[PDB]
Amino acid sequence: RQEEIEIEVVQRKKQIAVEAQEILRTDKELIATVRRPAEAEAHRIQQIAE
Amino acid sequence: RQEEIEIEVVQRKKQIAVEAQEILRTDKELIATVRRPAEAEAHRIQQIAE
Amino acid sequence: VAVQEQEIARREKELEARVRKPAEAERYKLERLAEAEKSQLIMQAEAEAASVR
């Protein structure tokens, strides 16, 4: 059982490296889904205001 | 799986070049559907006003 | 991550054609259509004024 529970430990040890890529993925995803679309929506206003 | 997900990467790499032509297409399309028709509609007014 | 690092360059082109270009076309339409509305109202004003005098 010491060796069996160690399987869970190495899984967590790797899951940490998975979530490290998840942050980076979520960051780029927010640039494409939030930051850039909002910047486009703001330009419409500056044009239709004229 | 590193090679499989690379297929999606090269697809995106090309999709960028597709949308680059899409901007240019949409630009010319707006000249024919909006800018020129509006310029014609404005001339009617200047004539029927006389 | 590499796939979404290209999705950025994608939206940056899609939004230019979907969001920016048509809003810019609408601005030009509104401006040249406004000149026509003004032109008709000044000509009509002159007609009503002449008809009164």
Q: Which ranges in A1-50 belong to alpha helices (H)? A: 2-30, 36-48
CA separation, residue C25 to residues A16, B14, B25, C13, C35 (Å) = 49, 28, 14, 17, 16
How far is it, in rounded angstroms, from Cα B27 to Cα B33? 10
CA distance B28 to chain C (A): 10
CA distances from residue B1 to A21, A28, B6, C1, C4 in whole angstroms, order as listed: 16, 21, 8, 14, 17
In chain C, residues with a C-beta closer than 8 Å to the C-beta of B5 are 2-3
CB contact under 8 A, C1 and A43: no
B5 Cβ contact partners less than 8 Å away, ≥ 6 residues apart: C2, C3
Q: Give the method used.
A: cryo-EM
Q: Give the chain C residue nearest A18 (alpha carbons).
A: C1
Q: How far apart are CA B11 and CA C9, in angstroms?
A: 13
Is residue B9 within 8 A of residue C6, CB to CB? The reply is: yes
Residues 6+ apart with CB under 8 A from B42: C32, C33, C35, C36
CA–CA separation, C4 vs B19, rounded Å?
16
User: What backbone phi and psi angles, to 5 degrees, belong to A49?
Assistant: -70, -40
Count CA atoms within 13 Å of residue B29 on its CB side. 10
Cβ–Cβ of C32/B42 closer than 8 Å? yes
Which residue do the tokens 């002449």 mark? Answer: C50
Contact of C38 with chain B, judged by CB distance below 8 Å, is answered with no
Residue A39 exposure: Cα atoms within 13 Å on the Cβ side: 14
B6 three-class SS: helix
Measured CA to CA, the distance from residue B4 to residue B38 in angstroms comes to 50
Q: How far apart are CA A36 and CA C18, in angstroms?
A: 13
The residue of chain A with its CA nearest to that of C30 is: A48
Q: Does residue C29 sit at the A interface (CB-CB below 8 Å)?
A: no
Give the number of other CB atoms < 10 A from CB of residue B50: 6
C-chain residue closest to A22, CA distance: C1
Resolution in A: 3.5
Q: Do A36 and C5 touch (CB under 8 A)?
A: no
SS3 string of chain C?
CHHHHHHHHHHHHHHHHHHHHHHHHHHHHHHHHHHHHHHHHHHHHHHHHHHHC
